[PDB]
Amino acid sequence: AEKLFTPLKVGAVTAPNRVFMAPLTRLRSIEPGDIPTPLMGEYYRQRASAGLIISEATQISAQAKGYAGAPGLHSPEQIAAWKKITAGVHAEDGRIAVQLWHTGRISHSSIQPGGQAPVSASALNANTRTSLRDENGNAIRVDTTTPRALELDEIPGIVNDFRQAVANAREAGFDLVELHSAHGYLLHQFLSPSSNQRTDQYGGSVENRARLVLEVVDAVCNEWSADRIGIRVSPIGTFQNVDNGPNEEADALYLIEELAKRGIAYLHMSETDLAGGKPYSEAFRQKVRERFHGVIIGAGAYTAEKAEDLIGKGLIDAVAFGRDYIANPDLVARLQKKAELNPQRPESFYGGGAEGYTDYPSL
Ligand SMILES: Cc1cc2c(cc1C)N(C[C@H](O)[C@H](O)[C@H](O)COP(=O)(O)O)c1[nH]c(=O)[nH]c(=O)c1N2
Asked: Required co-factor (predicted)?
């Protein structure tokens, strides 16, 4: 019966199981330089039995930065450090995708180049908080800075920054990329009418609001290959940073139909904020499944039992676990053996060092 421990072709790679590691911001990179570390390499290597590791959100550019301690994939030193991390995963016969973001308005002027306002679709504060570092290097929360709206002639540069970051990801040895089009970051700021009041061709209709993300998809497929590209969306519900507007189901199905035309490797649906939301209806899952023929990854407070049920129904192909992967490097073996999980320590999810990061034991 069990399908979680069977292989799955995911674009250009083949996962040996359906138990994926969700992208997890942990804010442990080196500053200055937003540089991945050998400790981050150890953490990912410990989890390399995952069917697929999806990395923490990683900046496409310095402007993309919104959190102190989040890594980039735009500088030589970042590329060199990520090469070591992907090599370590591959040494253990793993597969790893890099999640690429621009945080847009979920950012703060103090970590923007030049100390000026971050950018977005419109000049509306997100009215939330991001993460900085205090003078001792510890993670602190700070109110987001009001963004400025991207001028029309700046949008090709944003598309080019995603393209360049994917070129860099290929050099750095990643198996796949995941475009971060979820959770209220820049691509989702354009997608949502709540964060996008533009009157040019990047605002208004759903076609206009999806224009930027689809330009990015086309640019990165052209740069590398469609079967190397995944995308994460969170198109139903309210996320800390944004909501999906009054026609969220129709708009989501429009976007998914467009993504399918590009033949990309996978659609990763983040179904809920950590703070909760209404479950996806099975009717909606069927409409998604019939618009996207490729791999569908479900995430958001999943259990192994919920994953088996939906995989068995043919509605998703894999599950990404977030917090269970923080706490269980060998989550695959634990789920296969029905072993107990280590307890989670959420106080060390963000920032710090090895404690709460590489010190969760394997069986
Ligand atoms: C500490 C931490 C950090 C992040 C996250 C979660 C948490 C707990 N999540 C959301 C994550 O990918 C996953 O969707 C939710 O954690 C899955 O839910 P479970 O944790 O399995 O219940 C997340 N999602 C994302 O697209 N990119 C990221 O960088 C982050 N950062």
From this structure: FMN
Find out whether 148 and 120 touch, Cβ atoms under 8 Å.
yes
100, two tokens: 């690429």
- The DSSP bridge partners found for residue 14 are 9
Nominal resolution (angstroms): 1.5
Please work out whether the CB of residue 149 comes within 6 Å of at least one atom of ligand 1: no
CA distance 102 to 180: 8
CATH (domain of 95) = 3.20.20.70
Minimal-distance CA residue to ligand 1 atom 22: 301
Q: Active-site positions? A: 185
CA pseudo-torsion sign 202, 150, 71, 346: negative
Neighbours of 346 (CB within 10 A): 11
Compute and round to an integer the Cα radius of gyration of the chain. 19
Displacement of CA 217 from its chain's centroid (Å):
14
Is the minimum distance from the CB of 349 to ligand 1 under 6 angstroms?
yes
The structural domain count of the chain equals 1
Alpha carbon nearest to ligand 1 atom 24, residue: 23
According to DSSP, residue 224 is labeled S
Rounded distance between C-alpha atoms, residue 236 and residue 245, angstroms: 9
Domain of 37? 1-363
Asked if 65 contacts 110 with a C-beta cutoff of 8 angstroms, the reply is no
